[PDB]
Amino acid sequence: EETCFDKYTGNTYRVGDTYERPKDSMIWDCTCIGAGRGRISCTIANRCHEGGQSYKIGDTWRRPHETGGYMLECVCLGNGKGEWTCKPI
């Protein structure tokens, strides 16, 4: 059967199956390409993470303030860069 194996995760994938693979202190979105011995194709994911947990594009993680004593509220904007915006109260 057409399946690709990623030694990083340890689970095989059928053709057209995408998964998550941690590459160099990062999370990669990988897909399995058929034909041959199951070629593995991996490309970075269009998301924003770091700090403590992962964050999606346009997502929010309104949590306390790192440099303040009040609940901080921040957002994440993609646009192929990885920017964020917060407005504490």
Side-chain angles (χ1 to χ4, degrees):
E1 285 182 271
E2 304 162 270
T3 75
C4 321
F5 178 79
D6 198 329
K7 63 185 184 80
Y8 272 56
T9 91
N11 264 270
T12 347
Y13 329 96
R14 235 147 144 187
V15 191
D17 236 90
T18 74
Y19 56 104
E20 332 190 321
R21 183 269 281 288
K23 206 105 185 180
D24 288 89
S25 302
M26 199 157 82
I27 280 276
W28 284 64
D29 194 88
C30 297
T31 331
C32 147
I33 281 68
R37 320 242 89 162
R39 250 182 190 179
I40 286 82
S41 170
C42 291
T43 49
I44 316 125
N46 49 84
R47 273 130 256 192
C48 53
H49 64 326
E50 228 176 86
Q53 287 283 274
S54 52
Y55 321 102
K56 271 78 182 285
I57 304 295
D59 256 61
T60 70
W61 63 103
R62 298 98 43 237
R63 269 180 182 181
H65 193 11
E66 290 203 271
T67 62
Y70 52 23
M71 319 197 183
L72 190 72
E73 42 169 65
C74 214
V75 101
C76 182
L77 298 144
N79 232 94
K81 200 176 214 186
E83 208 172 276
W84 23 83
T85 222
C86 353
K87 196 178 278 182
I89 316 93

